[PDB]
Amino acid sequence: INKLYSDIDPEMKMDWNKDVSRSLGLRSIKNSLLGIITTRKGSRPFDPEFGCDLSDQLFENMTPLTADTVERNIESAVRNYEPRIDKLAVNVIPVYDDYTLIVEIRFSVIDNPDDIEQIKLQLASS
Amino acid sequence: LADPDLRPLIGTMMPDSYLLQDSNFEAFCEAYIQYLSDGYGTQYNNLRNLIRNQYPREEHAWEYLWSEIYKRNIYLNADKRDAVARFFESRSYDFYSTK
Amino acid sequence: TVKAPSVTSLRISKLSANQVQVRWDDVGANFYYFVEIAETKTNSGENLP
Amino acid sequence: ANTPVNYQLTRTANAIPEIFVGGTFAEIKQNLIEWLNGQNEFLDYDFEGSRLNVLCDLLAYNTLYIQQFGNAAVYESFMRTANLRSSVVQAAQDNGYLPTSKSAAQTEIMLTCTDALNRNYITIPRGTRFLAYAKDTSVNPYNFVSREDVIAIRDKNNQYFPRLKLAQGRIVRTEIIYDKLTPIIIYDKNIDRNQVKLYVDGAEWINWTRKSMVHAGSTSTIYYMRETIDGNTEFYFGEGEISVNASEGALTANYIGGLKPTQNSTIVIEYISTNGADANGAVGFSYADTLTNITVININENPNDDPDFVGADGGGDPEDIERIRELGTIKRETQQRCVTATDYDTFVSERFGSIIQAVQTFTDSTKPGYAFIAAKPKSGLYLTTVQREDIKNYLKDYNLAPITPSIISPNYLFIKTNLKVTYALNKLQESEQWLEGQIIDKIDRYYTEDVEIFNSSFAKSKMLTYVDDADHSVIGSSATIQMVREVQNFYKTPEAGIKYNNQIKDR
Amino acid sequence: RTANAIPEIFVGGTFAEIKQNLIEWLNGQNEFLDYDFEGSRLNVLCDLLAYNTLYIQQFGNAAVYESFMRTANLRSSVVQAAQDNGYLPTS
Amino acid sequence: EWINWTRKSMVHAGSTSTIYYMRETIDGNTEFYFGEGEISVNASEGALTANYIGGLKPTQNSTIVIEYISTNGADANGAVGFSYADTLTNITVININENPNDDPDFVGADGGGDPEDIERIRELGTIKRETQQRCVTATDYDTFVSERFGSI
Amino acid sequence: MLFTFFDPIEYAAKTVNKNAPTIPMTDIFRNYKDYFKRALAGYRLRTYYIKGSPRPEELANAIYGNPQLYWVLLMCNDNYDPYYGWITSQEAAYQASIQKYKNVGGDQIVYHVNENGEKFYNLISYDDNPYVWYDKGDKARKYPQYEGALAAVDTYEAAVLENEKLRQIKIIAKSDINSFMNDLIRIMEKSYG
């Protein structure tokens, strides 16, 4: 299934043999995911709803609610624009000292819903 | 004067995180902008000063050449043949109003 | 006592390598024309002379 | 022999700046595929690697998608490159010449009618409608209405004919309260701007523009037309300093643009929508609207006979992009007043453009003071003498003072032909006779396709091509021509004699 | 390779149309299998093109009748239209 | 000093005429220009040759100074109250007689204008395209004629 | 949102070449600008200001909550181009200015503006008295057209004021935006025929 979900390499790296480099299957799924999360809401040209907003103010102050509030959006955001993930779960650990959200996401691609894999993402700039 | 290419807007035109910062991909799409708006013929630039070029007298203007006076003047002097045309066609009214 | 004036439109109409068809304008009648060739580059550099 | 050259003429027949020209997609890509190549960012990436290729392949698709937008607009943007017709009028309208909507079938009648009241003078009020069957078909008459008021002296013996001329349709008048912010549309199809007349409260204003336009009326009275892109006409008039400017003839000066409105100057307009171009040659008439005490005892066709004439006139398609396209340039070239011979060509082409397929303006060097005109009634070869008189005077409006317009139908070579055309019975289930009715169309098609246009050399055979082309179940087609002229005097040849321009067999 | 015929049907005035109409051009061939889903760098690139093209589609008619007088709202071309008819707009 | 036809006619005069044409950059600022009547002599014997088009091209490197007025035309009107701002030697104005040499109808100043009134100008453009400097037909004349001394 | 409303039209490329195929396309060649006048004339435009340098349609959302109507704003704005007609950030504007002047030259002092705000084009002081200004092309020494202390405008700053003007817009109320919409639509039916 790694063949499936052929997507251009986000970096457009030089691939050996000179063709466009590629993100392979499930390598792309991360990228699109990694893409959708960072993007500020409203920054899509005709789609305001895209991207998971982050308020550095709210990002500054973490509370199990504030965490939970964020916890939904990503889980919400990813769920709408990324049908390739069947069973997805988010974990967010906000870090107190620098005010950093680190976020874990365990998800399962459609083809292997029993398989589990996680990603590690952190956010900063408070 | 340089008609600015649409290139400075690429930052806002796509969402940022999908431009990365420097990728071939962005630079890839960047040159696409170049091909679309630059210089004399590019479709944006093509259509942007279109009306501007319509006087005729300005540079890059096909008008007089379309027409009559320029066609038939038998003026020789191919070069300034162009200058004597489009200068009439510039005004080219008084001639008729007085014709 | 005065110059055979010139050709006006003067051009190489086509290029097939090592070959040219050159077009100068005919100008006046019964004027033969003096066609030269000169050498840009020595193949060492360009337009060296 | 033929044409020697020094680098001559210019840029084909007409401008194509041709950076705009739409190219073939593959080439478009082929061009663009090079573009991405050589890009400093990567000299590495191989495009013929199918991965990038289809990716770049897509860019061209949009780039082609987007180009025809950018390109076509230019064709559009430039008259005579304009492919849209409603475009063409705009610049033409802008050039001071408009094409018009189908222009009512028009005619004149004299009718002898006894007034039952025996008053000295009856008027025929503007707007009495008459019926005319189209030629050879009585199933329906074509209604047509009195163009204007006319009165008649009662002759002694008490019977007296008025005469009046007739355009086809129904008078349709609509009042509108004018308002500052609003379009004024007439959504009426079959409208024609030439039969449009209106009333502001009271007095009539004229779109300057081919109604009168030289009179003491000071230009304060005025308005415009325009064509909604929809196909219906909207009204317009100049707002504010409606006259040239400023103080002009008034000592009080200040400012008047008229039509405030508030409610002022409730605008009432009156027009005829028409069925025309279908109504040409409508001979049998009726007196289709009664009046008080007037009784038509006879309506007799065509006063001042041609003698060769048909019922009504006019109509029109309206539209042809080809005759219209270049044409207004001459009107763009010329001022309103017509001066140049071809200016008299194009000017005449405005009004009675649907009367005239082709009009030939020329001087006859013999008679100065006369504008000699050769035109095509385009229904026929002979404009009825009233038409001739009609457009003349109207034409005569725009003209040099000592000059007089002089309209004559020129002599006409006639092609007299028997045709021999074969078809396979079985090959056609269709009614044989109607086939002839088919070809008899396609014959003039060639003419209208060709011959009247330039009045150049005429190809018999090439004519026979299209009639050959008719049924394709026509097996073969043959014809023989007899060149035919008409002579005015059997008795004496015209002084110069007559020439064929064309070699004939002796005897 | 021209894996599919290049249609000129081309239609649509709004974005979804364009982006959509573009995707079927991207549909119908292999080796890039995602291109549908947002956040895919490929489907993302697909976005801006339509984004651009629309405005062009948008911008086009603006000048088109701005090239015509009497429908030209922008002053300076009306100015130019006057320049056409021979009148310099007075200062 | 050069003339403009603008408001007038290049088909009037010849090629080879000292002249200029104002016009409008689309940006809204004035560009102006001239025509080339550009002029030559075959041998020297003939008179200076009129070629090209009504105008005369100043040769390259020509010195061009142009004099004009930046203006505020709105407040221009009214403006009765006046003074002598200048100072000129040996010449001393004791009085400026305002509304001098006048009829008993006066305002301090005239002139002004948008100028354009972008809609209002459309007509004007819609008009002048119709206009003629020439006189033709009949009633064209007398109009233009009686523009002169209809007082007579 | 408009052009999809009308039927797409077939179009021939004739007059580029005597034979080119005909293509269907969505219509730009209805004006829409008159279409949006008639209907527009019913209500009013309301001037409006911009908080930042957003995109027209990105901005078009916040007001109306509907990103789809940018053009409504656009036609009320009736700019020549959507790309340079809009508000633009300092970064771009400078670069834009950088672009346009670059061949001419960078950092080009565009004009001198007096205290009063009157822009003085093509002027330089002979430097003896910086307050007296002889213009340029003069070599000075002659005809100072003004004397005093004036500001000069940097091409960067020059770029700012240009894009600055774009800030306010005339717009129609988000209340009427709906009521308006139907009417124009209805007009288009009259405009279809």
mmCIF file of N, CA, C and O in Angstrom, chain A residues 33-68:
data_model
loop_
_atom_site.group_PDB
_atom_site.id
_atom_site.type_symbol
_atom_site.label_atom_id
_atom_site.label_comp_id
_atom_site.label_asym_id
_atom_site.label_seq_id
_atom_site.Cartn_x
_atom_site.Cartn_y
_atom_site.Cartn_z
ATOM 1 N N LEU A 33 -0.691 15.662 6.608
ATOM 2 C CA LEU A 33 -0.992 15.895 8.014
ATOM 3 C C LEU A 33 -0.080 16.975 8.568
ATOM 4 O O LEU A 33 -0.534 17.967 9.149
ATOM 5 N N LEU A 34 1.225 16.755 8.459
ATOM 6 C CA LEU A 34 2.166 17.763 8.910
ATOM 7 C C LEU A 34 1.882 19.111 8.254
ATOM 8 O O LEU A 34 2.059 20.161 8.881
ATOM 9 N N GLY A 35 1.419 19.094 7.000
ATOM 10 C CA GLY A 35 1.024 20.330 6.338
ATOM 11 C C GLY A 35 -0.203 20.979 6.951
ATOM 12 O O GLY A 35 -0.199 22.172 7.263
ATOM 13 N N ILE A 36 -1.273 20.199 7.135
ATOM 14 C CA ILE A 36 -2.552 20.757 7.572
ATOM 15 C C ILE A 36 -2.478 21.364 8.964
ATOM 16 O O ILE A 36 -3.140 22.371 9.239
ATOM 17 N N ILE A 37 -1.657 20.798 9.843
ATOM 18 C CA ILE A 37 -1.628 21.229 11.234
ATOM 19 C C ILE A 37 -1.021 22.617 11.377
ATOM 20 O O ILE A 37 -1.595 23.494 12.031
ATOM 21 N N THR A 38 0.142 22.841 10.771
ATOM 22 C CA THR A 38 0.878 24.072 11.028
ATOM 23 C C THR A 38 0.125 25.283 10.492
ATOM 24 O O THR A 38 0.140 26.355 11.106
ATOM 25 N N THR A 39 -0.553 25.115 9.360
ATOM 26 C CA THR A 39 -1.175 26.219 8.641
ATOM 27 C C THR A 39 -2.176 26.986 9.494
ATOM 28 O O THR A 39 -3.053 26.397 10.133
ATOM 29 N N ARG A 40 -2.028 28.310 9.507
ATOM 30 C CA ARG A 40 -2.993 29.167 10.178
ATOM 31 C C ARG A 40 -4.332 29.095 9.462
ATOM 32 O O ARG A 40 -4.395 29.032 8.231
ATOM 33 N N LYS A 41 -5.407 29.092 10.241
ATOM 34 C CA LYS A 41 -6.734 29.122 9.658
ATOM 35 C C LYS A 41 -6.893 30.351 8.775
ATOM 36 O O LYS A 41 -6.292 31.401 9.019
ATOM 37 N N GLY A 42 -7.703 30.211 7.727
ATOM 38 C CA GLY A 42 -7.963 31.314 6.837
ATOM 39 C C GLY A 42 -6.878 31.570 5.823
ATOM 40 O O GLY A 42 -7.071 32.410 4.935
ATOM 41 N N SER A 43 -5.752 30.858 5.903
ATOM 42 C CA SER A 43 -4.645 31.153 5.005
ATOM 43 C C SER A 43 -4.774 30.426 3.675
ATOM 44 O O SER A 43 -4.055 30.759 2.728
ATOM 45 N N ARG A 44 -5.687 29.470 3.565
ATOM 46 C CA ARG A 44 -6.007 28.954 2.246
ATOM 47 C C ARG A 44 -6.696 30.056 1.456
ATOM 48 O O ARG A 44 -7.441 30.862 2.028
ATOM 49 N N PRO A 45 -6.490 30.110 0.170
ATOM 50 C CA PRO A 45 -6.992 31.230 -0.621
ATOM 51 C C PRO A 45 -8.500 31.358 -0.583
ATOM 52 O O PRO A 45 -9.044 32.399 -0.201
ATOM 53 N N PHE A 46 -9.183 30.286 -0.952
ATOM 54 C CA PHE A 46 -10.630 30.287 -0.982
ATOM 55 C C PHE A 46 -11.241 29.489 0.148
ATOM 56 O O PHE A 46 -12.467 29.473 0.287
ATOM 57 N N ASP A 47 -10.429 28.840 0.963
ATOM 58 C CA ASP A 47 -10.964 28.078 2.080
ATOM 59 C C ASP A 47 -10.494 28.741 3.359
ATOM 60 O O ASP A 47 -9.323 28.580 3.749
ATOM 61 N N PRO A 48 -11.353 29.475 4.049
ATOM 62 C CA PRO A 48 -10.935 30.021 5.341
ATOM 63 C C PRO A 48 -10.813 28.949 6.410
ATOM 64 O O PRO A 48 -9.948 29.038 7.287
ATOM 65 N N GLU A 49 -11.657 27.917 6.344
ATOM 66 C CA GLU A 49 -11.732 26.923 7.406
ATOM 67 C C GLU A 49 -10.484 26.067 7.521
ATOM 68 O O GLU A 49 -10.317 25.390 8.540
ATOM 69 N N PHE A 50 -9.601 26.086 6.530
ATOM 70 C CA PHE A 50 -8.469 25.179 6.556
ATOM 71 C C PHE A 50 -7.436 25.624 7.573
ATOM 72 O O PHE A 50 -7.324 26.800 7.921
ATOM 73 N N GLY A 51 -6.664 24.652 8.037
ATOM 74 C CA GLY A 51 -5.634 24.931 8.999
ATOM 75 C C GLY A 51 -6.227 24.886 10.380
ATOM 76 O O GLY A 51 -7.414 25.170 10.572
ATOM 77 N N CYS A 52 -5.405 24.551 11.357
ATOM 78 C CA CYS A 52 -5.837 24.492 12.740
ATOM 79 C C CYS A 52 -5.309 25.735 13.428
ATOM 80 O O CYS A 52 -4.093 25.900 13.574
ATOM 81 N N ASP A 53 -6.221 26.612 13.830
ATOM 82 C CA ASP A 53 -5.772 27.873 14.373
ATOM 83 C C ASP A 53 -5.028 27.632 15.677
ATOM 84 O O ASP A 53 -5.256 26.652 16.390
ATOM 85 N N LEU A 54 -4.139 28.560 15.990
ATOM 86 C CA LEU A 54 -3.447 28.557 17.262
ATOM 87 C C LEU A 54 -3.361 29.996 17.733
ATOM 88 O O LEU A 54 -2.833 30.856 17.022
ATOM 89 N N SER A 55 -3.877 30.254 18.924
ATOM 90 C CA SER A 55 -3.750 31.556 19.556
ATOM 91 C C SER A 55 -2.570 31.480 20.507
ATOM 92 O O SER A 55 -2.625 30.765 21.511
ATOM 93 N N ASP A 56 -1.507 32.223 20.191
ATOM 94 C CA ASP A 56 -0.342 32.255 21.065
ATOM 95 C C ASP A 56 -0.710 32.622 22.495
ATOM 96 O O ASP A 56 -0.062 32.155 23.436
ATOM 97 N N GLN A 57 -1.748 33.440 22.681
ATOM 98 C CA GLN A 57 -2.261 33.690 24.025
ATOM 99 C C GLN A 57 -2.740 32.400 24.679
ATOM 100 O O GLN A 57 -2.241 31.997 25.736
ATOM 101 N N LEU A 58 -3.726 31.747 24.064
ATOM 102 C CA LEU A 58 -4.142 30.425 24.513
ATOM 103 C C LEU A 58 -2.978 29.445 24.476
ATOM 104 O O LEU A 58 -2.835 28.601 25.366
ATOM 105 N N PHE A 59 -2.142 29.538 23.441
ATOM 106 C CA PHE A 59 -0.935 28.723 23.368
ATOM 107 C C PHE A 59 0.006 29.000 24.530
ATOM 108 O O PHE A 59 0.728 28.100 24.974
ATOM 109 N N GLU A 60 0.011 30.231 25.034
ATOM 110 C CA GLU A 60 0.840 30.559 26.185
ATOM 111 C C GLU A 60 0.340 29.831 27.424
ATOM 112 O O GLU A 60 1.085 29.079 28.062
ATOM 113 N N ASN A 61 -0.932 30.010 27.756
ATOM 114 C CA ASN A 61 -1.499 29.449 28.972
ATOM 115 C C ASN A 61 -2.132 28.106 28.644
ATOM 116 O O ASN A 61 -3.127 28.040 27.914
ATOM 117 N N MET A 62 -1.557 27.048 29.198
ATOM 118 C CA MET A 62 -2.085 25.698 29.094
ATOM 119 C C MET A 62 -2.879 25.336 30.341
ATOM 120 O O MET A 62 -2.461 25.625 31.466
ATOM 121 N N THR A 63 -4.034 24.713 30.126
ATOM 122 C CA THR A 63 -4.863 24.123 31.169
ATOM 123 C C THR A 63 -5.448 22.861 30.569
ATOM 124 O O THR A 63 -5.596 22.780 29.344
ATOM 125 N N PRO A 64 -5.753 21.849 31.388
ATOM 126 C CA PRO A 64 -6.376 20.640 30.827
ATOM 127 C C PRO A 64 -7.547 20.948 29.912
ATOM 128 O O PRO A 64 -7.756 20.234 28.925
ATOM 129 N N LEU A 65 -8.318 21.993 30.214
ATOM 130 C CA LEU A 65 -9.294 22.536 29.277
ATOM 131 C C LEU A 65 -8.627 23.113 28.033
ATOM 132 O O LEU A 65 -8.941 22.697 26.914
ATOM 133 N N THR A 66 -7.743 24.100 28.220
ATOM 134 C CA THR A 66 -7.036 24.701 27.090
ATOM 135 C C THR A 66 -6.379 23.635 26.232
ATOM 136 O O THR A 66 -6.453 23.676 25.000
ATOM 137 N N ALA A 67 -5.719 22.674 26.880
ATOM 138 C CA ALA A 67 -5.189 21.525 26.159
ATOM 139 C C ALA A 67 -6.317 20.808 25.438
ATOM 140 O O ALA A 67 -6.238 20.546 24.233
ATOM 141 N N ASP A 68 -7.380 20.472 26.177
ATOM 142 C CA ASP A 68 -8.508 19.761 25.589
ATOM 143 C C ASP A 68 -9.080 20.552 24.424
ATOM 144 O O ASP A 68 -9.414 19.984 23.378
#
